[PDB]
Paper text:
The K1/2 values for the wild type and the W396F variant are comparable (0.060 ± 0.002 mM and 0.079 ± 0.004 mM, respectively) but Vmax of W396F (8.8 ± 0.5 nmol·min−1 ·μg−1) is roughly a half of the wild type value (15.8 ± 0.4 nmol·min−1 ·μg−1). ABTS binds to both mutants with a significantly lower affinity, but the maximal velocity is not affected.
Bilirubin oxidase (MvBOx; EC 1.3.3.5) from the ascomycete plant pathogen Myrothecium verrucaria (Albifimbria verrucaria) is a member of the blue multicopper oxidase family (MCO). MCOs are capable of oxidizing various organic and/or inorganic substrates and reducing oxygen to water without release of reactive oxygen species. T1Cu is connected with the trinuclear cluster (TNC), composed of one type II (T2Cu) and two type III (T3Cu) copper ions, via a conserved His–Cys–His motif (serving as electron transfer path).
Numbering used by the authors: 1 to 534
Amino acid sequence: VAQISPQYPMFTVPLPIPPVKQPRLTVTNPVNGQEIWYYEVEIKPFTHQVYPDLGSADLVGYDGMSPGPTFQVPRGVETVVRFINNAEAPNSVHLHGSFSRAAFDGWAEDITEPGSFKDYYYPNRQSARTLWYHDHAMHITAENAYRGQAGLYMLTDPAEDALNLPSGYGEFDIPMILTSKQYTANGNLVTTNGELNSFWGDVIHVNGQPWPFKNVEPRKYRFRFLDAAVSRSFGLYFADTDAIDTRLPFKVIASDSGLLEHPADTSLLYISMAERYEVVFDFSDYAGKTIELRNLGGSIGGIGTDTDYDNTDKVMRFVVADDTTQPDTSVVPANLRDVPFPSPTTNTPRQFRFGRTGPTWTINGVAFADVQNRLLANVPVGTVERWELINAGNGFTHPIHIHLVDFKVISRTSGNNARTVMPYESGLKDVVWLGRRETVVVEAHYAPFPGVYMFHCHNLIHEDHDMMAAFNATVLPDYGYNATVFVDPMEELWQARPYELGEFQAQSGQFSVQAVTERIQTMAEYRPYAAADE
Ligand SMILES: *[C@@H]1O[C@H](CO)[C@@H](O[C@@H]2O[C@H](CO)[C@@H](O[C@@H]3O[C@H](CO)[C@@H](O)[C@H](O)[C@@H]3O)[C@H](O)[C@H]2NC(C)=O)[C@H](O)[C@H]1NC(C)=O
Ligand SMILES: *[C@@H]1O[C@H](CO)[C@@H](O[C@@H]2O[C@H](CO)[C@@H](O)[C@H](O)[C@H]2NC(C)=O)[C@H](O)[C@H]1NC(C)=O
Ligand SMILES: [Cu+2]
Ligand SMILES: [Cu+2]
Ligand SMILES: [Cu+2]
Ligand SMILES: [Cu+2]
């Protein structure tokens, strides 16, 4: 249907690469003698000239940019990030893909007010994977994410680096953060405020840029796909502009939680909100050609319900040189890793129905705001459970996300007989797409940390109004590991604290090296992640 946003000069602006975020300090952990990397991120308003010949867009971003800066953290290095709210609305940061403790996970009511900050303590112990950090504040998550509070967080491992996949952040390892937005006649964003069904967007962005292009060499690139859109799901394919409907083969090497067991040979990649898929595309057969990354129409070929617009079939263009300047020394091995699948369970699956209750998006008839009713599962730490995730509706779809865990996709049924489990769903994930009339069973190890965690639809419009609930990963009173201060996301110890802008700017007061060092060493003494040691 007709594009609403003004006409954009397609494929004329180079793909931006978010800069790598550097830590301010390292602090010695007195428990283990190891360095904890300490970072500061200031959440603040900024404007960005999206349309060349119109006015600017109003954004609020991590370090005043969108996407936020990219974190790059080696497995085994703990990090503390001081997220500083210098904006106009509260925030709650979630590191999506991280088994963070309840109070460091972005619980939706665990907000930071403007003129406050919160120290998030991250474990960085899980398998190499593409995480992303983004806003999770109750009621306002869609608008906070839409206006720019999302960025990438790459957990690296020299074992994955030894596979010799295409490498170098911004060289042959390229972030591909997909969003879908709408702009006014004067080039400002159309707000998501007021939208209660879905905010599709008619302008496709990669790394914050409408319909960009990139010059590539005829060799292999790693692409880290992330659907950071408010409501838009994609069906991605590559085509030569000389044969724009002919899909070119590629390999999926990783899902939300890390590498697949083997690359999945693929010409079409379904990716819904919050899903990450890493792809190796080989441009060697397309020297001197232009390859367009495109998006399936027909509401992702009958899987979705998303509205299609004039240019939502287009993502970006790659212009391929005639030759490489350096040898392609990268490979995609047939055997990537042994995926650490959870134990199979014979426990009867729990059922969660994703539907509407009057005008409100609900789980088993419940809204997250309803404290009394929203705790839907008590799961002893170490238990494996199958959850049967049910979309009974034909008129909407739900990418379902479960905090804490990585899960195996066991089964998909479709009331439209459309599809079962995809080859790139063979590994471990933390989001799975319930297409039209789809039921998915997932299997997860509820481990290794006790606490109260969220699960929800990651259509941010549905999540906000109000398709989200909680489970409690429970322990017996003799468990240890300071569980008493780590199970409650609202624990006073870990709450946001006020700051004065002056001290932040001067790096004085509670921003002094001494104050930060004492705060982190005190946090580290509680040993938040000890239960995951090996
Ligand atoms: C989620 O599960 C956790 C347990 O994994 C729950 O925390 C536990 O809450 C129980 C009941 O409040 C506590 O036991 C009680 O302790 C008090 C005070 O010492 C005592 O007077 C009672 O007779 C009883 O023994 C338990 O200590 C606590 N455990 C931990 C590790 O914090 C938590 O309540 C659950 N959260 C929700 C919202 O259900
Ligand atoms: C639970 O957290 C407490 C408080 O941080 C830890 O106790 C401290 O242990 C340190 C060693 O880093 C001592 O020097 C402090 O004097 C302790 N403070 C108190 C009040 O005990 C404790 O080690 C943690 N326990 C576990 C199991 O992680
Ligand atoms: Cu998320
Ligand atoms: Cu998450
Ligand atoms: Cu939904
Ligand atoms: Cu969440």
